[PDB]
Structures are given as C-alpha cells and as structure tokens.
Amino acid sequence: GSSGSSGKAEAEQNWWEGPPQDLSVHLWYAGPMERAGAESILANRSDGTFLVRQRVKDAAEFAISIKYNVEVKHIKIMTAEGLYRITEKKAFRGLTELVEFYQQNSLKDCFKSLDTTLQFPFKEPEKRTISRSGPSSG
Structure with missing residues (x-):
C-alpha cells in the first residue's frame, strides 16, 4: 500500500468589472x-409567444420576434442614452421595462401592420396544469 496527495480548491469572489443585470x-x-431559429422556435409555439434575440x-441591435398571424414577425x-425602444415614442431603462410596457400596448404603434402584444416568452416552460394558481389575498 502507498499514500498519495492530489486535489485543488477554488474561489468564488466577484472582483472583476462584471456586467450589469x-x-x-x-x-x-x-x-x-x-x-431562422426564432422562426422555427415560435413556429410550433402558440400565437403570442414573443422572443427577444440579438x-x-x-449587445448588438436587439430584436423582438413573436408568433402572429401564423407567422414569426420581428421588430427592431x-x-x-442606454434606453431600449423599438420606436422613438417612449424609452425604458432596459428590455424588461420596454417589453413590460408593450405587454399592455400593441406594437402597431411602430408597425400598424403588426398589431400584437408581448404575451409569453419562447423559453416559457410548458403550461400543462390541471388547475391554475391564484393565491387570493383576502
């Protein structure tokens, strides 16, 4: 029999100029x-499934694509000033904000032809639950 020494540890400390959110x-x-991807991803998805890609x-020109009229539309x-907006109508801190806004207002504002709204993301996990959730405050 013979003994041996092997092994190494690691360290987790963010000291770099890590990026923002x-x-x-x-x-x-x-x-x-x-x-193609976005067109093949939402292709099967359910109408309303939006997805943002670069x-x-x-950090290139972001674009929002969702399933509408049985076709995967895209928006520039x-x-x-650091704000994100598909149209020079209203800017927001970031996507989360911008998208969250359109989630209530149709995109027609920028593309009268494209009258849709951010329903659900493409990554969104399957939605098969006998009963939906809804904890009332009361």
Whole structure:
C-alpha cells in the first residue's frame, strides 16, 4: 500500500468589472439568435409567444420576434442614452421595462401592420396544469 496527495480548491469572489443585470435571466432573452431559429422556435409555439434575440453580436441591435398571424414577425429595437425602444415614442431603462410596457400596448404603434402584444416568452416552460394558481389575498 502507498499514500498519495492530489486535489485543488477554488474561489468564488466577484472582483472583476462584471456586467450589469444579466438580461439572460429572462425567458424572452435568446441572446444572439438567427432569424431562422426564432422562426422555427415560435413556429410550433402558440400565437403570442414573443422572443427577444440579438444580431449574432455582443449587445448588438436587439430584436423582438413573436408568433402572429401564423407567422414569426420581428421588430427592431433602437437604443438611445442606454434606453431600449423599438420606436422613438417612449424609452425604458432596459428590455424588461420596454417589453413590460408593450405587454399592455400593441406594437402597431411602430408597425400598424403588426398589431400584437408581448404575451409569453419562447423559453416559457410548458403550461400543462390541471388547475391554475391564484393565491387570493383576502
């Protein structure tokens, strides 16, 4: 018999210039995804399934695509002063905000042709529950 010594430990300390809020944490955040994908992802999804993707680049021109009229539509996202907005009508701190806003107002504002609204993300997990949740405050 013979003894031996092997092994190494690690360290978890964020001391770098880590980036801001990780939009990735969101479900409607499919990072740098190609059109095809979004078109093949929401293709089967249910009408209303929205998904935000980038232009195969870091913090590139964001774009919102959802399932509407049986077709995967896409919307350009303009950024100004750090704010995100598809149209020069109203800007928000970030996607979460911008999207959250459209979730109540149709996108027609920017594309009269595209009269839809952010329903649910593409990453959204299956929705098969005998009974839905709804804890009333009372």
